[PDB]
């Protein structure tokens, strides 16, 4: 039964109960149903008013935070001052493992681009202007900094400096379906050429970033970090949290560590015996 | 115009902040929402589903053998079968469970827990068990007559194949912490031990070694607070195809 | 008792079981045809009803001491079988639910437990390599595959947490059968039958079986019945 639950449930006092035919502590796990036995019926309790809020475990709260989807350091010298990143959430394992707790997701991305400049191995730190253009799937990808593909009449671009606050835009839910597929069992193509699972093809397209200025001054290191905070989140069909470490970002393939914890044979660190404990 | 002045925290990027930002795709209509089964609108819906504890973790148990506890007929009365360390933050039976994996994203926790043990032995197998829970403040009970003194359930095998051991909420505070101290008064949950109440009697035809399967789930009064990064997933050196996405 | 016995009548097929527990409905949903407001493809779909809705028994597998478990992917298991398999070939799209019934029985002197779980969108991995699984590895047809490492569910997740999915247990002490009713689970309202597999039926022996009685083969039989089938895109068969 669906209901509005803003807080944890209160407890009611119970008394000594001995009765035939009534066994609250018995259940059947073969039914695949969690035990419905209440603390009131299992033990003798007192009335407790529980004011503890459940609001912080909401999926809108749990999954919506700024995490690092992409980190790209490109050297700025005479050359090449741009990079094209095919958008995926499988890149960094911190956000990846949290988003994989659900099978399907429907959310709006809020993207933020943090820019920093470093010295290669002092005079001053230059202020550079960077462009971040969002290229949908099936469009022409810029092959050069000064190439004609950066005119971007139809495409969505953004201009920002290093001194200015981080550039921030919102990306709507663009999937052709009702929600994203975190895990996809099958192949995209109608022929055997398709790849198993989601491939960096359909999904969200590309993000192209360059430095708008020409090449000056003498080389510095410019690192572009990209952050994504979901919003308006809908989640379906939760899934077991992954244990073994990741191998590739395009698949689920696993290996496992040499020794526990998170070993292939043993996820939990071993102990002497089930009877062993101080 | 409107006279203004900036405040501290101007231009800062806070990862948890809540604000509206400029849309990059004007006049874009997302795909109409379709009803899909299994919507999770709160994570406490997930933690209340019972999942298998790994009690048998040892160096001699490999793979799936770690999720069952061997129960053999014993020749001495009043014998301990096994015990469950209740520390969720540390590495133990409760870490790989649903209630464990979700709770490790949160620094504080509250509410009752429940354990469920299913006896997978043969139909003709019979026996009585006792599942004890000792509140903190002392060493684990070595013997049953010391362990009875706490919350316990005496269980007899029968048609119903499972029990429910409710671990009640007992604390001096509204919440408990996952801080790395195992014996901390704000951390230690107590101890759970299982003793033979009478004995396990099996016919000569049935297999002598029977296996319990432990479960654990949060209750309806369970709660979590102060979300944090999960220590479970660690750094990963070589991540394949990650560099391929940069062209 | 009341819910220990169950009968399932779909089409010309019928299944009775005298040992069962309270058949499961996945996520509290029950299969239904695609409503008019969720429809996309304009062509009038075809509804075989009693033709394609009935129990198709899959090849039984032998439960042995070192068995790791079995999986069947749907529809893929049903694509070659019966009138269901013909509509799959001639039509471009389908929408249906599934009713899965697993039969495993033994004498009261056998001990063992099976975890029968339907994993929505199960993406399989490969052990100790970066190479994505091939087509023939994932698609086994009717016979289905076998878990290499059932402890991790072959995807790297935990078998301990597999109860979050729709599931039932077959405990050789209690019940000899498990029943799960699966609605249509997909992001898209209809789907291409050959490439994409919505559900993965996974039978895993959490507790193996052993006894001191004279040994005998214990098979595990699976009966899968489609429900509320629709099809669009009538054309020639792929064959």
């Amino acid at each position: 039964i669906e209901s509005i639950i803003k807080t944890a449930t209160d407890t009611v006092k119970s008394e000594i109960n001995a009765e035939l035919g009534v066994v609250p502590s018995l259940n059947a796990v073969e039914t695949g149903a969690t035990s419905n036995t209440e603390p009131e019926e299992a033990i003798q309790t007192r009335t407790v008013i529980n004011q503890h809020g459940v609001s912080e475990t909401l999926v809108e709260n749990f999954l919506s935070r700024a995490a690092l989807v992409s980190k790209r350091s490109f050297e700025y010298k005479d050359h090449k001052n741009f990079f094209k990143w095919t958008i995926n959430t499988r890149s960094f394992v911190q956000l990846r493992r949290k988003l994989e707790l659900f099978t399907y997701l429907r959310f709006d991305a809020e993207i933020t681009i943090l820019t920093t400049v470093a010295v290669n191995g002092y005079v001053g730190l230059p202020d550079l202007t960077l462009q971040a253009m969002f290229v949908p799937t099936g469009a022409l990808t810029p092959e050069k900094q000064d190439s004609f593909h950066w005119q971007s009449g139809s495409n969505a671009s953004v201009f920002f400096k290093i001194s200015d606050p981080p550039a921030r835009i919102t990306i709507p839910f663009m999937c052709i379906n009702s929600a994203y597929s975190v895990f996809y069992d099958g192949f995209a193509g109608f022929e055997k050429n398709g790849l198993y699972g989601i491939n960096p093809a359909d999904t969200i397209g590309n993000l192209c970033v360059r430095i708008v200025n020409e090449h000056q001054p003498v080389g510095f290191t410019v690192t572009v970090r990209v952050y994504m905070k979901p919003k308006h989140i809908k989640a379906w069909a939760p899934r077991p949290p992954r244990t073994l470490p990741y191998m590739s970002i395009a698949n689920a393939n696993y290996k496992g560590k040499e020794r526990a914890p998170n070993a292939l044979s043993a996820i939990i660190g071993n102990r002497d015996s089930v009877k062993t404990m101080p | 115009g409107v006279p203004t002045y900036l405040l501290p925290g101007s231009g800062q990027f806070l990862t948890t902040d809540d604000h509206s930002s400029a849309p990059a795709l004007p006049c874009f209509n997302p795909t109409p929402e379709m009803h899909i089964p299994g919507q999770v609108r709160n994570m406490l819906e997930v933690v209340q589903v019972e999942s298998m504890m790994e009690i048998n973790n040892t160096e001699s148990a490999v793979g799936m053998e770690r999720l069952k506890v061997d129960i053999s007929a014993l020749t001495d009365v009043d014998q301990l079968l096994f015990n469950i360390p209740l520390d969720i933050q540390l590495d133990g039976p409760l870490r790989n469970t649903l209630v464990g994996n979700i709770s490790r994203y949160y620094t504080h926790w509250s509410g009752s827990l429940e354990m469920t043990f299913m006896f997978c032995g043969s139909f003709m197998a019979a026996g009585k068990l006792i599942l004890c829970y000792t509140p903190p403040g002392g060493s684990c009970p070595t013997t049953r007559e010391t362990a009875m003194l706490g919350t316990h359930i005496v269980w007899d095998f029968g048609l119903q194949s499972s029990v429910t051991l409710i671990i009640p909420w007992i604390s001096g505070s509204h919440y408990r912490m996952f801080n790395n101290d195992a014996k901390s008064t704000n951390a230690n949950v107590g101890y759970v031990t299982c003793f033979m109440q009478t004995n396990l009697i099996v016919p000569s035809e049935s297999s002598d070694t029977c296996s319990l399967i432990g479960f654990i789930a949060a209750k309806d009064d369970f709660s979590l607070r102060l979300m944090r990064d999960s220590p479970d997933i660690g750094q990963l050196d070589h991540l394949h195809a990650a560099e391929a996405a940069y062209q | 008792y009341s819910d220990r016995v169950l009968q399932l009548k779909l089409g010309n097929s019928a299944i009775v079981t005298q040992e069962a527990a309270n058949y499961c409905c996945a996520y509290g949903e029950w299969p239904n045809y695609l409503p008019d407001h969720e429809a996309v493809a304009i062509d009038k779909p075809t509804q075989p009803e009693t033709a394609t809705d009935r129990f198709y028994t899959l090849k039984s597998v032998k439960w042995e001491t070192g068995s790791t478990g079995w999986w069947w992917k749907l529809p893929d298991a049903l694509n070659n079988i019966g009138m269901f398999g013909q509509n799959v070939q001639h039509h471009y799209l389908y929408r249906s639910g599934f009713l899965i019934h697993v039969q495993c029985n033994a004498t009261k002197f056998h001990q063992g437990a099976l975890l029968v779980v339907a994993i929505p969108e199960h993406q399989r991995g490969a052990h100790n390599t970066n190479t994505s699984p091939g087509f023939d590895d994932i698609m086994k047809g009717e016979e289905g595959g076998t878990f290499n490492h059932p402890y991790v569910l072959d995807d790297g997740t935990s078998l301990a947490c597999a109860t979050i999915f729709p599931h039932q247990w077959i405990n050789l002490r209690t019940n000899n059968s498990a029943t799960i009713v699966l609605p249509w689970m997909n992001a898209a309202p209809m789907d291409f039958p050959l490439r994409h597999n919505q559900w993965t039926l996974a039978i895993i022996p959490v507790v193996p079986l052993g006894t001191r009685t004279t040994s005998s083969m214990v098979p595990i039989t699976v009966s899968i019945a489609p429900m509320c089938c629709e099809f669009n895109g009538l054309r020639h068969a792929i064959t």
Partner: antibody
Amino acid sequence: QVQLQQPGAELVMPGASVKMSCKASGYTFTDYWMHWVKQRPGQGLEWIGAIDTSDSYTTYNRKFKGKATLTVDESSSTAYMQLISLTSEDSAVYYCARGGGGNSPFAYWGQGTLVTVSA
Amino acid sequence: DIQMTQSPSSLSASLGERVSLTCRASQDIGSSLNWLQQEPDGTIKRLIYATSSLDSGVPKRFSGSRSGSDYSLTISSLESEDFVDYYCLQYASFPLTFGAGTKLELKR
């Protein structure tokens, strides 16, 4: 240190069977995947299949399904390839290479064996 | 089956001349590719792994890069022993496929 050598493959009559033996040494045998490649005198390469050394698990190319059968022995640290339905078209040079997730596969190779038939 | 199209199938060059070898990937295979050098005796020796790096102990005459879907094996300066059949492997997905190959000959 690390070496791969497979002997044998001299003369086999058509319709008979042949058992390839490729021995591995210099590392932990169960920590790496095993691959098989054939080369005809036509100099083109085809990929027979790969066996997971961790257990029996095997992956084949669709063309060689039922023609080739891969098996290993964890003790001898050797990998076997069972070729049935032997024909003159099956005569070629067969290779065995290592594998595994880290630092890409096919880091090491074998000597190769030219199979011939006598009719 | 992702088909690796290797071109050109043959070439002719003299000593100390820069040559390149390109393989096509129909479906995107990412960064996963291997360049294989097979000496006339039948011994195969890998050169480039994951297109990024070179094997240990292999001369630096060989380089590799990805531009779009093109995977280029560039040789700075040819040598007498460097005329042999070259191959490109894809470990991205099963089954693994090989390029058609390229033969190197000396100008006469």
